[PDB]
């Protein structure tokens, strides 16, 4: 019944969802992001938001579905494979985590805004390779 909202109202609804996320209100934030992912099928921020909420609630497989779609919407964003790699790790899937942290390092290395993440992705990758070996 919310279909057809203006961008400016979507923006305020994204703000609302982001704020609930910052306050650790993950169930409520998840619902707001799930709404926005229905309203706008292409805005990667909404899928990042939905993923992050599910991750914080321990719903790793559902977090992976959101991160996977998001990554299709912004092929340059290092957060998707990075947080996906965390979920794979918590699921005991070392090969998935290694792939994600590898991709995240490559995406983050190409962008100066993401210099801290690049180093984290490299650190996590090294940690995971150490466990497989």
């Amino acid at each position: 019944m919310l279909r057809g909202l203006s961008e400016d109202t979507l923006e305020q609804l994204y703000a609302l969802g982001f704020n609930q996320y910052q306050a650790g209100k993950w169930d409520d934030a998840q619902k707001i992001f799930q709404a926005l992912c229905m309203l706008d099928h292409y805005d990667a921020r909404y899928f990042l938001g939905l993923g992050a909420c599910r991750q914080s609630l321990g719903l790793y497989e559902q977090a992976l579905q959101s991160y996977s779609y998001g990554a299709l919407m912004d092929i340059n964003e290092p957060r998707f494979p990075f947080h996906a790699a965390e979920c794979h790790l918590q699921l005991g899937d070392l090969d998935g985590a290694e792939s994600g942290f590898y991709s995240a390092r490559a995406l983050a290395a190409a962008q100066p805004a993401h210099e801290a993440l690049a180093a984290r992705a490299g650190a996590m990758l090294e940690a995971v390779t150490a466990r497989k070996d």
Binding site: E11, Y14, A15, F18, Y21, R45, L48, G49, G51, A52, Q55, S56, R79, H83
Partner: peptide
């Protein structure tokens, strides 16, 4: 945990 894009 995850760093989301700031709104406004």
């Amino acid at each position: 945990r995850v760093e989301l894009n700031a709104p406004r």
